[PDB]
Write a protein that binds this ligand. Sequence first.
Ligand SMILES: Cn1cc([C@@H]2O[C@H](COP(=O)(O)OP(=O)(O)OP(=O)(O)O)[C@@H](O)[C@H]2O)c(N)nc1=O
Ligand SMILES: [Mg+2]
Ligand SMILES: [Zn+2]
Lengths: 41, 592, 15, 1170, 145
Amino acid sequence: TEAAVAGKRDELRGLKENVIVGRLIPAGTGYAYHQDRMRRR
Amino acid sequence: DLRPLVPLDGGRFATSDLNDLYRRVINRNNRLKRLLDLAAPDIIVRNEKRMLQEAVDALLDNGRRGRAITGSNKRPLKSLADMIKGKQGRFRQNLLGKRVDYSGRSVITVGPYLRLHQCGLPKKMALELFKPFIYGKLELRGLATTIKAAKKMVEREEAVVWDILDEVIREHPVLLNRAPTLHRLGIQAFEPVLIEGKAIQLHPLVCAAYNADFDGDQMAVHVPLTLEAQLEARALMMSTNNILSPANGEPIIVPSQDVVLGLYYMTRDCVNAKGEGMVLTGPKEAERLYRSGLASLHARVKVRITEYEKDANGELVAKTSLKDTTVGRAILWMIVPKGLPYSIVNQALGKKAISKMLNTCYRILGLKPTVIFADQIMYTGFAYAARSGASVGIDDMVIPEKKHEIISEAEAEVAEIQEQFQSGLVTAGERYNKVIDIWAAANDRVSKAMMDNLQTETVINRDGQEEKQVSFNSIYMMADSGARGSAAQIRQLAGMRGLMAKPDGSIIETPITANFREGLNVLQYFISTHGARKGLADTALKTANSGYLTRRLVDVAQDLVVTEDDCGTHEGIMMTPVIEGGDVKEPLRDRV
Amino acid sequence: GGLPRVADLFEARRP
Amino acid sequence: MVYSYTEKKRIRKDFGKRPQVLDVPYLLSIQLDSFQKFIEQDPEGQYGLEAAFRSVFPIQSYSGNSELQYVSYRLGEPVFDVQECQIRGVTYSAPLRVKLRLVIYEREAPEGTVKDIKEQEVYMGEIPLMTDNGTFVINGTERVIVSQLHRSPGVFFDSDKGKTHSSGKVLYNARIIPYRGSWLDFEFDPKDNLFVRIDRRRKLPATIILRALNYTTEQILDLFFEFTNDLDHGPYISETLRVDPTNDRLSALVEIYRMMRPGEPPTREAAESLFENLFFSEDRYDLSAVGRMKFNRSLLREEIEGSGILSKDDIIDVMKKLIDIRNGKGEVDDIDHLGNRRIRSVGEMAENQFRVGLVRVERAVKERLSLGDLDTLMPQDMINAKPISAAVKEFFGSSQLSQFMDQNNPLSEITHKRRISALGPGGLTRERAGFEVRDVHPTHYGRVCPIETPEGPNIGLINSLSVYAQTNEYGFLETPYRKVTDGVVTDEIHYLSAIEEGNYVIAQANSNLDEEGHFVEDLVTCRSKGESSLFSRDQVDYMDVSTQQVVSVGASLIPFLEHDDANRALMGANMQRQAVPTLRADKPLVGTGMERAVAVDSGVTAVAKRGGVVQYVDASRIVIKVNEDEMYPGEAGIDIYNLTKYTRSNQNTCINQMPCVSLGEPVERGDVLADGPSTDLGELALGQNMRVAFMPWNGYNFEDSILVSERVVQEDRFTTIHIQELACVSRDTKLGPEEITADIPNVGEAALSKLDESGIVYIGAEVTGGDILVGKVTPVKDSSLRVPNGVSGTVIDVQVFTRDGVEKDKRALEIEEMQLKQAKKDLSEELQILEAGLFSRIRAQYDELKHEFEKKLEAKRRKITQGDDLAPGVLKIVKVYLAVKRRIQPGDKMAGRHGNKGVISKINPIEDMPYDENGTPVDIVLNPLGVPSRMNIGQILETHLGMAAKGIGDKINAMLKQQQEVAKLREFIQRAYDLGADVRQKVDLSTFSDEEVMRLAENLRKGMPIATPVFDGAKEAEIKELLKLGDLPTSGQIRLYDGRTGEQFERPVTVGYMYMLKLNHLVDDKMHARSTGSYSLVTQQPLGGKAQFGGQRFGEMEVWALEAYGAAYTLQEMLTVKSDDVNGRTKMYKNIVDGNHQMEPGMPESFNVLLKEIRSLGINIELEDE
Amino acid sequence: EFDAIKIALASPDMIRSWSFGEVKKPETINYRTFKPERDGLFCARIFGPVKDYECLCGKYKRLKHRGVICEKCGVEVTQTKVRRERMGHIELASPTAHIWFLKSLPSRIGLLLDMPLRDIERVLYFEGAEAIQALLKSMDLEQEC
DNA sequence: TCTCTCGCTGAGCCTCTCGATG
RNA sequence: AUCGAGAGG
DNA sequence: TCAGCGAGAGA
Ligand SMILES: Cn1cc([C@@H]2O[C@H](COP(=O)(O)OP(=O)(O)OP(=O)(O)O)[C@@H](O)[C@H]2O)c(N)nc1=O
Ligand SMILES: [Mg+2]
Ligand SMILES: [Zn+2]
């Protein structure tokens, strides 16, 4: 309810969010991968 | 298709709750459609409007305003808000966990011949777990020309497919998991060895980290599929990688039970045993003499030993001398890696001594020698526990002779204060404490006498003279070595059962003066059931609290990751020793 | 004491 | 000794030393008595059915001058017996038939006599019947109704101890609980003001209710005052009504109406109706007889009977008692005391459901009589049976206390029928229950077992009845004791309840009495008022009857149980109920003496009704010729017993009976004629006797593992039989029906060979998994019924059901009506013996007997030929039964009787086993380290004694090989039976014939049975005397040799005999694996059952572990390629087939489902591509 | 192919944009035969073909004519998976409130207004919410702030 | 400002079996 | 495919 | 059921 009335935006930065969406977590063997992503923008 | 209708064995179809609420809303809203043209009086118009409101409040979150709608049975219908929250909602049942392929389950048994990086897998399970790899390799060698042909060939099993199965799993790891899964060591990786039967064989040294015992436990198994997954399993999750705890700095592999008892018996010392007084050329002569039958393991002798030490930069330098020792210690010296001193086995080896040996080997020499040392220690312990023939009998539990005095005199003292209650001299709320103190003192006396008799029960004739030595009683050695059994349990077995408590928490005035050797009567046994039931009830109902606290702790900190090397700050915390009352509870070394 | 004590600390419960 | 025919064949030796003054009662009384009190004809209206009929009647129309009356009821005779119902699949019940009379009075004159009356009999549904063993057959299945323990009606005075109102004060309160009505309780507050709650509603002030009884403030002051003080009297009342709103009586009534029903306009003609329909009415309120008794006892009243409704005076006394308790002159009662909780059984539950449905037809009758009819109406037309029968049927089949019957062994079967539950309608809940209700209360002594209880979330809420416990007239558990008069213990037995027992002082059963009966010592240990202490002999009033008075049936079967820890005793008692019957029953060498009672009261054996002599014996039938003294003037005198052969139980085990009597033998009544499962010569036999050694062996018994010799496997000591049932229904469906012909498309010639011409498997055909049992083609497609997987047994039974609208095939002639032919042949054979006997008796008139027998045969044929009502949409059902054998293997669970359990690790070759100096190998090796940490020392004492029983059996056996003379056997066995300290059992062999002595010796050559009752067992010295008599060392330890090298172990080892069990946890049922398969329909994730070929669940905690490792690619595999991602798994399978180990994942479908649901709730959610 | 998830309130125009079918008056799937009735909850026209590449009438059955709606019966030919993708809408005759924004401890459908929860509920319970709708429409946020 | 009613929120993990009603 | 009843770690 | 913490009461 609060999110809908505030118009919030989710950036997918934690472990649980990437687990839920099905991407590599930003830790361990995936960490460098995410560091590449921010280097692409 | 996200709200389907499922057919049944009969003609009727199972129906979903959503399709009922939707139909109710549709009919209640469409009833107003025809009424608009008829121009009904406003009295009927207003009431129907409200009937629409609640109908919508049915499709949305139900039960938020009272009088939840129900269906054919006597249970409320589940709305759209019920499909997103709770333990059965999408988040906690289909997105943070799910069911997977290439998995299996079975009962577990002990395998005493395995190496630390191996496990035993049944072949019937394996032939079905690794099916696509077998199909591919069958296609590779030309034994089939289609998927159906390969499937039929695998189903009607021949001898050619078993060699294929042998080559597929040659260097392919698997993951094993036990259900409660409290820390990260509840999942590990192993190399599979094909066996016969239906149970899974497990290494004795990984049990304590899994919290597993062979009285009906089950386990699950999963198969990695990509090169990255196989390499991660080999490099991160392999059992040879995990030897130190993440919670503290203590080793997680540690022998126990039969290994400890075997090593403890192997390194004990006697007086006037056979073969005493010899001078030997080394450990091999001791082994030869013991296996021939000319000498005992517990004989005191002189042996010539050579040992290596770090010289100045990790170079092994040797030294040779004569040492007074026993046959068993010299025999055991043959598995110690090069670089450790001889004094580390020249004594009776308990549980803590074996753990210290393992830690010293890990510190001085590294990782690869440590696993070999551990496996050799397990083999030696299992081998030498069987040769002793250690057993337990009813005469092992010895009852002190003076017990019948200590209780009786105590029963006198409790009587005397009763006389002091005949004529007013002490408060009626005071004799309780004095009687309790008398009984506590008597129990302490009996326990001390029992232990004093049990610890030195052996008397030995050295040579025309008598002497005392540590005894070889089975229960005493099992308690002393640290394999099984605390002192209080021996107290209960051969001493006195002590003082019980009422269900409220008060102390029952009269103790149990019997032990488990000379059994209990009806009243004492009835008294002793309250504590057992209270313990079992406490265990049964407080697991959920721990689980809830763990889930909350995991939720609050799930996103913290090391992201840099140095932040540049200069603040911090001052560390001081914890001293309260006068005794230093925590020093000023381990905290920093 | 016991588990309720630590659950009360980690929840910042008011005395 | 032993006197009966059955027991004299094998006399068990007893070490007990206390005489038995009271026998063990019948173990199934609680169910039989309860159902008898419900179905019987009561001359008065005291109990169930008559009392129910005398409560909804008489019913008369309002001023209509018409009334209908009840006079009598009758139960009919069942159409089928138990076996016919079980085979058919229907309920075993009797029809209820009631005669009714209807009277219509003269118009305009109520006192005027009825002009005309009509009498008729009506039918009012079907009532299920209990069997002789205390079960019900609902749809061919046996069920158990469990007894409920609940708080008694009455009035109770409770409080709180620092829960709310942290100021540090106690808040006393009182509550009134009726049997059928609304609640009413009085409570205090921190301001010391009286408040009242009705039906657990908002706390309205107390004095208002007084204003609802037409009272004034001066009258209230006169009632509650004579003046205030600090201790003697409190101003609680005055300070309460000085802060109370409203006045008079109408204001109080309308305030009560507003507080009860929210909204609505308060009228006057419909205002006092609520107050009247409250606790002062009879049709909607009943504080019943036990409630009345407890209410009067709580208030210190000298009356026991009374009204089933409350009154102003009672409320005033409740308030005064609560105020007096507040004033420091009262006391609070214990809610867990067994004087406040009572037992409700199946008979009491059946009458309540017969009243719920009886009022439904009562309302309909009144409406019909209102319309009126000029004698055209009849009683039958105004009575319907649907609702009452619906209520009864729902209770018998859907209640929480009607449970699927546990049928592993006889002991579990008899333990299920003595359970007491604190759950169900009107009971507790698992979550709501705390810690105090789960405890062991001091009043449990002698009434419920403090040992036997489940270990999961039901601990403390399920209990077992004690051996000698009983319910009284009001329903409170009671226990027997012996009267003590003038200091001598007598034989008079009195049953005392928990309330009364606290008054006297009771001596423990382990006391020493002289020849006359006087106590020996000058002090006696006794109980009083929940405590225990020493007293003088002149003070004693009662005494216990037995040393097994405290425990239940399962606990009294554990030998040396007083040397064990209570946790392990609990585990052993719970584990004895899981044992599986083996191929050959085997008696225990060490026992307690309760085996015969359990085996006989279970009802699994066959017990002779009358004495006589055996005439014909066979593997399926027994015939007894009755003695002259037990005949009747006009009956033949033949008893026929038919036995059960290879029938499946509820848990898919085997039930089989075999005879244990020979041709020409004499039998007295109450003698065992045949054994059922797990019975050996009339004694309960759960496991097997194994020779065991306590030592470690190369790490193969490292932690609760068990090493077993191959000799055990070769001799089938633990092989079991399992029976399974499969079905094949033919349904009428659109677009073409199913096919029952043998023809099947794409089926090889060999496939049809196993089946018959009609496509049905033959009897005795041996089949494996994935083999066609019935040919089924769906119009076609292959839908043939086959063995799913793994199971590979033999077809032993085929059944066929048909409707009266279709033809019959060849197998419908050779197996369907051939079953009827076999049944008719069996009936003819059964009748022929009696017919021939009567004809032979009368041949040394006949037309009447011939006509009667022909009529009986015709009736039997008509009963057999009757059809059955099948489910709509089907016409024929085919049922097939399969039998398989199971042998032990590594991975199977085994246990003892003291909580010692384990799994089998290895089957060892026999030359590898440890052996003694005579070359005899052992059977089992167990780890000694598992003994001392637990305190179950009783498993060691059993072993030593178990050795002593074998040695005696050795010396007899040798005497039967080197054939000796009878006097030596007589002398040795006499010396064996006389060994002891001072025992209560005496066996005299001088009164035996030589043949009897030889038979007894022949039954003793495998070992001499020993009985050691709980708390009255054998001592160490007696065991050592028996060992010395057997020429064995008195330590229990011998020398052993390693079978691999021939070398001697360094220390002596403990070797003996022990009783072991095999449990129903088989590795064959638990192993499963999957690679690919079927997925759910909405969230396309794999299914989750072995029966459905499902995958394992990878939960949140496993995800946490992988996250703590850092293995990102493994987690991504676990969430996409092996899960609800659809294109990724296909591409991955193709890649693995092609040899390329690489994945390209996508988006899971569950996320799309969640997004669609969020959109459905009227909320916009989007993936921001930019 | 994305980096963020955005959430906001919905509007009638957005809801009608999400839709493929008009207001659903019929109540039932169709119990008599497999073919569902039109315009209801289950409908072949609104949510797509029941079976792959086959129209309901059966006039088109195979690929090369895909993407062409049938003339006689007006059925699009597409894979049946679309039946778990498309949505529809119900056009009401009277406005109704949303329970989530009303039922809460900080009730946010009456947080902007000064009316208490009890009074707002009494007006909404009528003892249809045109009063609430007009009151929220007329309010000017900038002047109030 | 400081007590006192009044209420929705939450409550460990993974397997197996039966029946009744969809 | 939910609802009740039990069972194992 | 049982704690826990707002939210809305008032003297
Ligand atoms: C009943 N239960 C049991 C377990 C698991 O079961 C393990 C012990 O079960 P167990 O049979 O091996 O007995 P245990 O080893 O303790 O003692 P003995 O072997 O008899 O001496 C225990 O670690 C625990 O994880 C659980 N997670 N929830 C439960 O509700
Ligand atoms: Mg286990
Ligand atoms: Zn079309």
